[PDB]
Structures are given as C-alpha cells and as structure tokens.
Amino acid sequence: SDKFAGMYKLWTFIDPRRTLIFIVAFQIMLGILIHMIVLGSDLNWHNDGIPRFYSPRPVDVAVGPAGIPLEIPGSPMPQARNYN
Amino acid sequence: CDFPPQDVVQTGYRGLGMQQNYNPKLLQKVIDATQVPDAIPAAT
Ligand code: BCL
Ligand SMILES: COC(C)(C)CCC/C(C)=C/C=C/C(C)=C/C=C/C(C)=C/C=C/C=C(C)/C=C/C=C(C)/C=C/C=C(\C)CCCC(C)(C)OC
Ligand SMILES: [Ca+2]
User: Fold this and answer.
1) Buried b vs exposed e over A36-60: b needs ≥16 C-beta within 10 Å?
2) What's the Rg (C-alpha) of chain A?
3) 3-state DSSP call for residue B27?
C-alpha cells in the first residue's frame, strides 16, 4: 500500500558507501559458494561426460584373497593402496 | 642426512598418515645384497 512511501528516508541514517561495499562483497562471496556447492553434487556440469569424455578413464586393480592388491615377487618395495 | 627426493608408498585412507618411505640410496644397499641363487636342473 501507501505505507512504504517514506522508505527513501532509510538513507538519512544508513550510509551509502559501507552499504554498497557490503552488498558487492557479499554477492561475489555467494556466487562462488553456490557454484562450488552445485559442482560438488550430481548436477556437476564440468565432469559429467556430456557431451563426451575428454580425459582417459580410471582403471581398477585386481585384489587378492585378503582384499588388497597382490604383491609382485621381486619388487624391492611393497604395493600401494588407498583404502585399507 | 638423507637428501631428497624419496619414494613413498601409500598404504591406507587419505589424510591419515599411513605410508612407507624409502631412500633410493639406502634401498640400493638392500638390493645389492640379495642375489637369488641359480637353478639346479630337475632330476631324471
Ligand atoms: C542448476 C541451477 C541451480 C542454481 C545455480 C545457481 C548459481 C551458479 C548461482 C545461483 C545464484 C542464485 N540463485 Mg540459483 N540455482 C538453483 C536453484 C535456486 C533456487 C531454488 C528454489 O531452487 C533459488 C531460490 C535460487 C536463488 C538464487 C539466488 C539466491 C542467487 C541469485 C543472486 C541473488 O542475489 O538473488 C536474489 C534474487 C532472488 C532471490 C530472486 C531469484 C530466485 C530465482 C528466480 C530462483 C527461482 C527458482 C525456483 C524454481 C522458483 C519456484 C517458484 C515458482 C513455482 C515458479 N537458486 C539450482 C539448484 N544459482 C547466483 C548467485 O548467488 O549470485 C550472487 C549464482 O551464481
Ligand atoms: C528519518 O526517518 C525516520 C528514522 C524517522 C523514519 C525511518 C523509516 C524507515 C526507513 C524504517 C525502515 C524500517 C525497516 C526497513 C525495517 C525492516 C524490518 C524487518 C525486515 C524485520 C524482520 C525481523 C525478523 C526477525 C526478528 C526474525 C527472527 C527469527 C528468529 C529469532 C529465529 C530463530 C530460529 C531458530 C533459533 C531455529 C534454529 C533452527 C536450527 C534447526 C538450524 O537450529 C539448530
Ligand atoms: Ca559437461
């Protein structure tokens, strides 16, 4: 209604410089944050493989009866894993 | 002193420690001492 007609008076005790600075900084921060939240999701568009994958794909390593990769019988160092 | 670089083998989840560390110059002394013996021909 006509109850909002005197809202400009807001700027007689809230100043423009600090307000503009705060707004701009906050908007950039929010932009970066939302892009990173959507990237870390199922909606990720850089890594989805649409329209095509461009890098080579992961290759699994076969395991032994203990569930970890097999040792190689003359290697002078054990084999790496990442899961334990 | 063991000057860099080294060889590291990861053996567990990420960010947990849990890895083995080798110095190529020290591991050469263990490699230079094994000497598998030579085969003996199977018997009739
Ligand atoms: C796949 C796309 C992603 C998405 C990816 C991004 C990315 C990337 C960015 C944003 C940005 C924005 N997004 Mg978005 N966004 C999504 C879904 C939403 C939903 C929701 C209800 O689903 C809302 C409310 C928003 C709202 C917003 C704003 C907070 C922000 C805009 C800048 C700003 O200062 O806003 C003030 C303006 C408003 C609050 C009005 C805008 C609301 C818009 C129109 C959302 C309406 C959508 C929803 C379906 C409406 C339902 C109502 C009716 C049935 C039609 N998004 C989906 C999940 N969004 C940008 C930002 O943070 O810039 C600073 C930004 O970089
Ligand atoms: C010179 O002119 C003069 C000064 C004389 C006249 C000036 C006139 C003007 C311009 C006046 C302007 C006035 C304005 C712009 C007023 C705006 C007022 C607003 C928008 C007020 C909104 C208030 C909202 C409130 C108080 C909401 C509070 C919410 C609370 C406390 C929620 C608590 C929720 C909890 C704790 C739940 C937690 C949930 C969970 C699960 C995450 O917790 C673990
Ligand atoms: Ca894509």
Assistant:
1) eeeeeeeeeeeeeeeeeeeeeeeee
2) 28
3) helix
Here the tokens at position A33 are 């944050």
Residue A77 in contact with residue B7, Cβ under 8 Å?
Answer: yes
Minimum-distance ligand to the CA of A39? 1
By the 8 A CB rule, do B26 and B2 touch?
Answer: yes
Q: Are A36 and A43 in contact (CB under 8 A)?
A: no
Question: Is there an atom of ligand 1 within 6 Å of A78 CB?
Answer: no
Give the C-alpha separation, B31 to B18, whole Å.
24
Identify the experimental approach: cryo-EM
SS3 content of chain B, % helix, strand, coil (to 5): 20, 20, 60
Atom of ligand 1 nearest to the CA of A35: 8
Locus of tokens 């947990």: B16
**Does residue A80 have its Cβ closer than 6 Å to ligand 2?**
no
